């Protein structure tokens, strides 16, 4: 069904992970 959308928002968000280390890494 909709399981093929594995955190579809996070997958795109981590693209700019260079500035995400402030609240991730």
PDB file of C-alpha atoms in Angstrom:
ATOM      1  CA  UNK A   1       0.000   0.000   0.000  1.00  0.00           C
ATOM      2  CA  UNK A   2       1.791   3.085   1.296  1.00  0.00           C
ATOM      3  CA  UNK A   3       4.718   1.296   2.906  1.00  0.00           C
ATOM      4  CA  UNK A   4       6.869   2.136  -0.105  1.00  0.00           C
ATOM      5  CA  UNK A   5       7.086   5.626   1.387  1.00  0.00           C
ATOM      6  CA  UNK A   6       9.720   4.784   4.013  1.00  0.00           C
ATOM      7  CA  UNK A   7      10.060   8.153   5.793  1.00  0.00           C
ATOM      8  CA  UNK A   8       9.684   9.965   2.462  1.00  0.00           C
ATOM      9  CA  UNK A   9      10.157  13.280   4.244  1.00  0.00           C
ATOM     10  CA  UNK A  10      13.310  12.263   6.105  1.00  0.00           C
ATOM     11  CA  UNK A  11      14.871  10.821   2.952  1.00  0.00           C
ATOM     12  CA  UNK A  12      14.671  14.266   1.362  1.00  0.00           C
ATOM     13  CA  UNK A  13      15.586  16.111   4.547  1.00  0.00           C
ATOM     14  CA  UNK A  14      18.875  14.278   5.092  1.00  0.00           C
ATOM     15  CA  UNK A  15      19.983  15.488   1.642  1.00  0.00           C
ATOM     16  CA  UNK A  16      21.156  18.675   3.318  1.00  0.00           C
ATOM     17  CA  UNK A  17      22.627  16.764   6.224  1.00  0.00           C
ATOM     18  CA  UNK A  18      25.602  19.111   6.171  1.00  0.00           C
ATOM     19  CA  UNK A  19      23.566  21.521   8.281  1.00  0.00           C
ATOM     20  CA  UNK A  20      21.563  18.811  10.033  1.00  0.00           C
ATOM     21  CA  UNK A  21      24.380  17.670  12.318  1.00  0.00           C
ATOM     22  CA  UNK A  22      23.046  20.250  14.765  1.00  0.00           C
ATOM     23  CA  UNK A  23      20.035  18.026  15.472  1.00  0.00           C
ATOM     24  CA  UNK A  24      20.952  14.578  14.196  1.00  0.00           C
ATOM     25  CA  UNK A  25      24.576  13.561  14.546  1.00  0.00           C
TER      26      UNK A  25
END
